[PDB]
Every structure is written in C-alpha cells, then in structure tokens.
Amino acid sequence: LIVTQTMKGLDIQKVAGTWYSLAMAASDISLLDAQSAPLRVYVEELKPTPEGDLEILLQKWENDECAQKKIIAEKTKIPAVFKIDALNENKVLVLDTDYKKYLLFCMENSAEQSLVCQCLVRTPEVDDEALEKFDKALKALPMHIRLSFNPT
Amino acid sequence: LIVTQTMKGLDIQKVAGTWYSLAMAASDISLLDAQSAPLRVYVEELKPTPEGDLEILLQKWENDECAQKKIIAEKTKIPAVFKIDALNENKVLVLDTDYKKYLLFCMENSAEQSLVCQCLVRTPEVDDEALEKFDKALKALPMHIRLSFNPT
C-alpha cells in the first residue's frame, strides 16, 4: 500500500486495551482458508510500550485449542506502520481508528501483494459504523475473501 | 450509600474491557493500610456476561507476588448495584462512567459504613478529568485515606 492509505496523526498509546476481531478480509483466499493459516488470527489486546512499539496479543486455532501468541511490532520511520521483525518479515499498518470504538489494520507479507486486514471493535455493540468504515476502506484493495463474525 | 448516588441508566455491556486503577480512597485507614488488606485490589479488566452479571479481574499483592483474582458480581434489582455473593457479602456500586475514559466505583462491606472506592481509567493518559470527577464524587463521603498512583 501507499503512505497515503494509512492513518495520519495516530497516537499509539490510545489504542491500548481490549479489542475484538469482528471482520476479516484478504487478497488471497488461501491466507484465511483454514484456521491453520498463519494470518488467520484474532486480536485480543493491544499493548503499546513506553518506547512506541506495539505488543499484540492474538488467539490462533492450534491443536484443537485456542492458543495465545504474543508478537511485538516495532515502530518504523513511518507513523502508523509497524514491523514484525521475525525470520519471516511482516508489516502492521494502521488504516484508521477513533480509539474508542473501532480500529482498522492490515498485515502485509513484506516482500512487496499479500494482505490480510481486520476490523477491530472495543466491545461487541449493535452499531455497524466499524463494518461500514472497513467496507469503505477495502474498496480500494483487491480482496478475494471476506469474513464477518457473529463474534466468537 | 443511597440509590441517588449511583449511576442512572448504566449500560453494563459498554464497560467491558481493560481498565487501570488510578486512585483509591476508603472510609477507614486500615482498609487500604497494607497490601494484605482484602480491599486493596487493582482492577485489570471488566467482563460483563450475556446475563447482565459482572466478572471482575483484579490483581492483589500475595506472597511477594502479583496474584490474580476473578470475582463475579451478580446483578441485583437496583441498576448500577452488583452483589459479590461470597461467604462475606460485598456490594459493587457504579457511581459514574463515560464508558470510554473513566469509571468510578465503590465496594461496600455489606452489613450496612465501610467503603472503598476507586477511580478507573481506560488508558494511562495525562488528562485529570477522571481524578477531578473522583474528587467531586467523594466530597459527600467520609473518607479517611486517599491514594493516587503514578501508575503501576
């Protein structure tokens, strides 16, 4: 994606806390096909560090269980863009948030293409503003699979 | 306390999520004296149930450790008033909240007197609206000890 599709003026400290993954989409079906897939993960909590990095607590189906994963996304020179600096490099991009209700973000398999985005909400409310904003923000991207939860 | 000092129109589903205990006060010094005290506890998370009860995740200093406690406060016929129906009965009273920033609540040792109240905030921000509201809400109560964290 381009720098102009990410959030301007993000304050990472205000996204702290609990979140629920309400909807997901990906540029390739196989990315979210079976639970197994590496990018089919549910965000449980966001924990910014005093240094400006982001600790992400995620749930992943593993061995017929609900497994927990803790990943650190490090700040980069681009605000709103975080790097998961593992053997397989991944970027976390914050598209938009109002901090108190929703948060839209994508994970890109950095190579330069392959994108998985999610719509996060603070609590499981009956308003569909977050779904509509996700929908609007994904109009520009070539997504081939879209999922919406009756939350889990 | 009286019914008129609790929140009117509380929506318990919107308090879900992460919270930090920023300030505490009590009607008796001994209630918050040493960590040991039963009511000297830090709220980590609030989890309402589909049935309208409240699950509270708390931290407590125990055996030179940070111990976790999970307590269920059951709804009562008074909105904003929850009952911890343990051997030693306790009530949880929600005084006020704006759901996205702060939450003021007290725990009363039900007998009919002994009160511990806290000021909770969603994230550790530099605004002092929650502290001022706590201050204002405790003007009417006979508190003998007041604590404010440089958060933990």
Curated annotation (Swiss-Prot), chains A, B:
Main location (coarse class): secreted
Keywords carried by this UniProt record: Allergen, Disulfide bond, Milk protein, Retinol-binding, Secreted, Signal, Transport
Post-translational modification, as annotated: Alternate disulfide bonds occur in equal amounts in all variants examined.
Tissue specificity comment: Synthesized in mammary gland and secreted in milk.
Pfam family for this entry, one: Lipocalin
Function: Primary component of whey, it binds retinol and is probably involved in the transport of that molecule.
Protein name: Beta-lactoglobulin
Organism: Bos taurus
High-level lineage: Eukaryota, Metazoa, Chordata, Craniata, Vertebrata
Gene, per the UniProt record: LGB
